Design a protein around this ligand. Structure first.
Ligand SMILES: CCCCCCCCCCCCCCCCCC(=O)OC[C@H](COP(=O)([O-])OCC[N+](C)(C)C)OC(=O)CCCCCCCCCCCCCCCCC
Lengths: 206, 55, 48
């Protein structure tokens, strides 16, 4: 019982503390660690054995050594009822604790959904190889949704390539050696014209 | 669950040591008074002898 | 969606404040369990 029974309990508390960054959390970790050390403190003092016969013989008050023994033994029989406590702690505990039981459960479900997204993508990616070996309309079917977006660019007459793409990487590759190196402005439509004109005291609007 | 089981366990021993320690101190403490009563009784005998000399 | 004070459903755990706080409010509650047992056992009879 005494040795090796607290090793696992130290790894858990250590990680919980390492994850703590804000001072507020670190304080709660100190409180948590104290209670664990408080409950897990080991008691070893070599409980001495009482030889009532020895004291009874050397010297004692008549009826005292025997009265102490019978009363002493009666309390030694009493012991903790570990069973009752074992059940209550396992049945229900700290309805406030249920707050994070349901918070971390939903928090984990969010990031399990993301883990499945990345996992399933790498799974489907196994059958897709060598984009240069597929026809045009077949590649768009692997990447379902691009044809739909391509129709949106066409039906809105956004036929300037890369206008609605935040990083028109294809536009930078084509302009690596162009004169007046520039890429189309974001969301530029081939029909919009923001031109103005003014008349000043001078000519040419100057 | 393991912290509660180890708490009641070690706490059970502490109570056990408390009782036996109490039962042992009360016994030793009583013996101390018993020896004092014996010394007081014999001291009176010596006191009686000294008074007899004075008389 | 009813009993959690958060300004978004995109839950991101970057500290263990909410976790350790609920543990000290839980494991502490079960204090005095052994001392309470000692009351019954010791209040049973007087050694004397
Ligand atoms: C092939 C069959 C079909 C062909 C169809 C025609 C396709 C034409 C291909 C595109 C031609 C585009 C020419 C743009 C030239 C811009 C260069 C530039 O940015 O200047 C940078 C230059 C140079 O800067 P730079 O950094 O870009 O290049 C530096 C060059 N070196 C490396 C040599 C130093 O600086 C300037 O800003 C000067 C601007 C002068 C612009 C004069 C050109 C005006 C002509 C365009 C208007 C025409 C409208 C016609 C509308 C008709 C309607 C009826």
């Amino acid at each position: 019982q005494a040795p090796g029974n607290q090793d696992k309990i130290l790894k858990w508390i250590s990680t919980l503390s390492n994850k703590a960054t804000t001072g507020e959390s670190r304080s709660y970790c100190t409180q948590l660690s104290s209670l664990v050390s408080f409950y897990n403190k080991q008691h070893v003092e070599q409980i001495p054995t009482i030889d009532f016969n020895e004291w009874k013989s050397v010297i004692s008050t008549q009826g005292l050594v025997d009265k102490v023994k019978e009363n002493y033994e009666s309390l030694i029989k009493e012991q903790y009822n570990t069973d009752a406590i074992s059940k209550q702690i396992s049945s229900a505990s700290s309805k406030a604790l249920d707050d994070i039981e349901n918070e971390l459960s939903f928090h984990a479900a969010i990031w399990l959904n993301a883990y499945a997204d990345y996992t399933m993508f790498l799974f489907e990616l196994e059958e897709y190889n060598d984009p240069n070996d597929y026809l045009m309309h077949e590649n768009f079917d692997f990447f379902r949704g691009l044809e739909t977006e391509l129709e949106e660019l066409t039906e809105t007459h956004n036929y300037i390539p890369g206008a609605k793409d935040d990083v028109n990487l294809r536009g930078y590759l084509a302009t690596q050696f162009a004169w007046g190196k520039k890429v189309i402005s974001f969301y530029r439509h081939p029909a919009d014209d923001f031109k103005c004109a003014k008349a000043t005291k001078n000519m040419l609007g100057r | 669950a393991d912290s509660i089981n180890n708490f009641l366990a070690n706490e059970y021993l502490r109570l056990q040591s408390h009782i036996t320690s109490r039962a042992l101190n009360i016994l030793k403490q009583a013996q101390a008074y018993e020896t004092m009563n014996q010394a007081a009784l014999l001291q009176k005998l010596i006191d009686d002898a000294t008074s007899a000399i004075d008389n | 969606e009813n009993n959690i004070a958060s300004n978004t459903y995109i839950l991101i755990q970057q500290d263990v404040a909410n976790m350790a706080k609920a543990y000290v409010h839980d494991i502490c509650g079960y204090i005095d369990v052994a001392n309470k047992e000692n009351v019954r056992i010791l209040s049973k009879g007087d050694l004397i």
